[PDB]
């Protein structure tokens, strides 16, 4: 208290420091600024509309050449605090990911060094428009790009130089964060003749895939399949049950359809790859075709589907004659055709069923790569 | 330095906060407006609301900020907050469904002989004329009108950028949709002594080909069942029961379809075009199913002393077999053949018609994008 | 008339933040009261509500009786909100959402210290109505509110209307109803052991509801359903033998309908409150129908199978006739439906009883509150 | 400028913003309202809430705004922002669904004499009766009152100017439709107090509903069902072999009817429409119900049915005889003289009912048409 | 009066608010705390969000606050407005979802000395652990830590006092239940940085949940569908004459729980849980499938069953005797023996993994309970 009162009167901040004047030692280069990016949390991932809500520690550094102190300031306390108002504040701009203004990363507590350098590093709840596309769904699941920096100023006015990822990742993401490159830069453009403003470029390469869809989604696949696969088994064990063979295909039919229904529902949440979607619907087709097969091949058959003496000779005539008929039905039986039928069912459930997990594997060989 | 104090102090001594960047009634100040777009994030196709993001570049000149040796000739270019002036308050005639985000009160580029550049990116809640005319393959146009909101062009004039700038300069890549172009026309509604708004056109194109595909399946598949229930009658006449099961099932199906239509129009409705006729193709496989049913219906029945007993025997069997022989006559299958070739016509024809219209809808009403 | 000079005098001396206090050990006397005007949202599962309350605020401050120029110019006055001491109100009780538009309004000074101010406020709160308050006997909504600020040794509130209501300005878009409304002024000392007593304002609100629309929603399906199983029960004594399966079909049918009801209304008392009472007659009346329903089939399942060479040969054949007859005969004895006939009256009275036991008791929870 | 500095400084100095234009004890402040709803953005039935465009034309007068060559000389009448003024707290009595949009801090035009107008471009949140009775074909008149919130007739008075149609700027994108709307003035004096209170503008919105697409979809199943029903009669009499066949149908359909129901009652829940509108769909739809249930129980109804070589021949022939009897029994059980009876007995019922159904359709179609 | 003005004026003259109240490089600002949680208005389930009130009881002192007969004199302990003070920015590290509600603008306890407290009825939204594994039958302990934000050890300090339980003021109408809650203090410096970072209180909430309402209805359809499966097996022995029938009921059965599960993914997804629990109903349900798979595949199992005038009398009874042993050969397939086997077979198998489901059920809760 060493002239303290008095001295924070001397210096003045507001009155001796020109609030309105950026103390860049007059017209030169810049004062040299550095940004540090540390994610504190990632709360929500949207596949749909390429949008992520995440928290970042906005670690910022620049020298305040006016803030160089003396004994009853510097040395009195080599370290001291000063709020946002006594403080020129950049507007660091999430230059391609501030498709939602910055919160509670505006004008909050800063750290005042003992000979101008200043340190301001709080919390940023933000939204971003990261490069989703319908391609961020292959297993790679791409690399999310983001640039940070003091938006307005140029290379003669500002300069910003420059941490993983899983430091505080959301573990109740359905995704997985593989990596995390950080490297600054500066850049002039097409229309400008003159390089300027420098930025923090941070690529996020991730991956995601629950282990929960697998469980109720495959479950129906096999289930389903085996019904199309049984359908045809039952037409042997008894194919006369005509009506009730019928009920099964209505039944199997309707089941198949809603199930795929809640599939494009999560599918809107998130624009799905062409890779996976084809296999599912090219193949439940698989079945549909069969059920329609099941049809014609199941019901395709026309029918299968001495005077005294003179009188009982009428009946032995009636007898044989319709015996032709009666047997016209067993004709239809086609029972040495049996095992074929269901063997000719077996062959193609094997050729499809495999063709799929065969495809499953020709894509399950490269990723294990 | 160089007369620093002096420039600095005169300037903030004669500028006025509360005032208009104009000297009395002329001319006024010709401000420049031109927004390069960032990207668009949501088209609420249902309601006709538009949330996008662009840069409001404004720029005019301030002859009250002409500098001298040290901030003119010292550093010709200096960044200075706003607050100081006349900012564009702008609302959108149709749109401006809601405030500005990152639009106003962000620093600016002040050139030495007073040129002002202000370059702010912003999100803005709009709502354009998409209408219920954003599904025909022909798609539709829209008015986007920007302009201030208590100011009557009389102390300032507004002027544009390009005209060809397009709207597919920054059309969103993520789109399952597309862009034919965005016009820009400055206008001055005489209804009003106030010179107003500017009208920006929306000749948008909406091509998301993903699920119309498997929508194709239900129309063709559903024909399957169709063909199927009309093929079953001369296939196993005893289709009797089964057949009923075909149509409980054929009906429910088309009804659940009626389940998702509403639900899909949730985000997104318009023009029953699609709908409109697949509705008619609906009613069609309605009444054909049913009359065939009728078809089926059809059948009014179907749906010495020694020798005296023998007699009695001979008569028994032959007697009722002509009665049941009757029923054979009563259900011979003349209809089956003939209407499964009515079934030929009906199906074959109504099939390749909404095929057609959809054929024609994509291909025909597309061109008139100019 | 000294208009200027009187104003300017006491604004010399005027004190903001200082309460008009004789001394500091007696506090000020404050008058309050609320007239409901809007009961915007009754979320009773979550027991919260939103209401536009007329905050009748009154109190005394003779720091401003006036003279010649002011008392006497005008006994009445209108001078700004921001000009002293103002009460932050809140429902101890319910005040869940700080106040809306119910401040920054126009207060009322008498020329002598009478002070009146009313405002309107929409805010959130949280009433009774947990699993009860749906009956016919009402659970009184008890909301106490007071300044959330200071405690009673400087502040002390007054009151009203403990007796008289409610449906002055009750929501018409209630399926509820109020039947009394009490209002009391009280001291602070609770369960929790808190001293420094903060007065408050208790708001009892015993109200009614249940002008059911859905009721018959509920009503008709399940009458239909009882009847539908009365068809299941008497339709068998008319039905043929192919009706075993018949019947089953209806089983499928029966619960498809059943759980479609059970999905319905469960949803309802999630979205809004909860009370067991009504809930219960439904799903358990529902259960027990179920119950005897399938047991029924089990009843028409039961039963094993009901579910001289001349003469040589004429010998054997006339045997096979009357022999086998005694066979076919088996079927006769076996399916002598003593069970079916009776099974009509089984379920008949039973059906009655279930009907009665239920509606009759829903007749009581209607007939005691009658 | 013409007087430039002496102009500006004079006027700030002797001017108190706060102060409301009070000119001895008389006229108070005469200030009139004039709302011109430019257009409407959205409205909610369920929650009688509307977001609308309003340009508030506010007039009043300060004789202390007249002028000489040192204010008028300078620039005629000018543009003065709000702030300096005394602003009435306008408030939609039974509306006010919240705060006026973009109200604050706008501009106005004063005269070098004084004429002031404040006519800002508002759009806000409203609240109005709809009642059960709005989504009438006949409509309900939304009663909306406007006026001075906390100031009487002595302190001040809000007056009218303007009758004007609702369909002046009615949203074209309403599903709905107007009849007319009128607004007359009124002054509210109370038997409470001997004093003269403030003044109000009362709106009356008279409009009726319904974009006819809805209409259609729902009624067509119902003709659909008509034919099922119609089969239910026709199938059985023209063959009762597939009785259980139909059983099917009873199930598959009533559930369809159930699914329709989920759909429209949401909307019913989404939108309250005068409840006695629903009874229509009620008994109508429920007819289908009783119909079924009886037609198909009755369809069921029926007990039943839904030598000495020589003397061996006569033991045997006598066996074919009595079972000749018996045959005839059960066929004697399903006659084809009275199923015709139920045909016409109910089909006249259906043209009863049907025409009854057509009753309330046609009725308030004789009143709608008008 | 008692230095009236000399004492208040001096206090605000030599009073500052840029500065915090720091006393040399020391013990930090001795910050006291502890809990007063009395209400939990809302908390979700899905997003483990909690909006509760807790009065933040803070306690610390500022020497500058020491007094003589000119301020202690006065009135002992007077209560200052909040404004004056350097408040700590407290926050829920692993929470913080916003916003402490109603902290600004308050009341602050001063003593003639200095003793100072302010217990603020803060209500806010939170986010802490629980996850998938909260509702277990072994429980979870949401870890909630609180403490200053941007400020390490070297400067600043808070500390806990006291053990108090959870169930202290737990929500009574909790679909849910607490067991215990503990809060202990600490200071967390890291091996990262050589720097003493901040102090914090960490709550741990230990409580098990789940209403039973979901439980009574989960169980229901279980039992009941187990009935039908139980019938699925008894059928074929009492009623094999309905074989086709037992198929229907599979088509029936299966689509019905398949549908049950639709619900679930809607609701589960909506009210989150460790998938570990579904794995119960999984196999137990797939079981009914897996069991009608083998039992009706089995059921269908079986190929078949799934003089010269004297001479023709002999040609004829012959006709009968040859056939008769032949047909013996399809009956030979359906012995009505091994049907009793397969239901015994699986009766026990379903009695046992029935007791199974009652197993994990109750096991789970023999572990819950503990």
Author numbering:
A (entry chain C): 1 to 162, 178 to 320, 421 to 484
B (entry chain B): 1 to 164, 174 to 312, 403 to 469
C (entry chain E): 1 to 164, 172 to 314, 414 to 476
D (entry chain A), E (entry chain D): 1 to 306, 374 to 437
Task: Reproduce the article's own wording on this structure.
The nicotinic acetylcholine (ACh) receptor is the ligand-gated ion channel mediating fast chemical transmission of electrical signals between nerve cells and muscle cells. Like most other family members, the muscle-type ACh receptor is a heteropentamer composed of subunits having similar or identical amino acid sequences arranged in a ring around a narrow membrane pore. ACh binds to αγ and αδ at the interface with neighbouring γ and δ subunits, and the pore-lining helices of the closed channel make a hydrophobic constriction in the membrane, which functions as the gate. Here, we investigate the structural mechanism of ACh-receptor gating by propelling ACh-containing spray droplets onto postsynaptic membrane vesicles lying within a thin aqueous film and then trapping the reaction by rapid freezing.
We find that the structure from the closed-class tubes has a similar loop-C conformation (left and middle), the same pore profile and the same pore cross section as the structure from the unexposed tubes. In terms of these defining criteria, there is no distinction, confirming that the sorting procedure was effective in selecting tubes where most channels are closed. While these interactions are not identical in the two closed-channel maps (due to differences in lattice curvature), loop C in both examples (left and middle) extends tangentially from the body of αγ, creating an entry path for ACh at the αγ–γ interface. In the closed-channel structure, the M2 helices composing the inner ring bend inward and come together near the middle of the membrane, creating a hydrophobic constriction, believed to function as the gate of the channel. In the closed-channel configuration, αγM2 bows inward toward the gate (orange bar), whereas in the open-channel configuration, it follows a straight line (indicated by the broken line). The δM2 helix also bows slightly inward toward the gate in the closed-channel configuration but straightens predominantly in a tangential direction when the channel opens (see below). The diameter of the closed pore is about 6 Å at the assumed level of the gate (orange bar), where the lumen is both constricted and completely encircled by hydrophobic side chains. This region and the nearby extracellular region form an energy barrier to ion permeation across the membrane because they contain no polar groups to substitute for the hydration shell and so the ion is, in effect, too big to pass readily through.
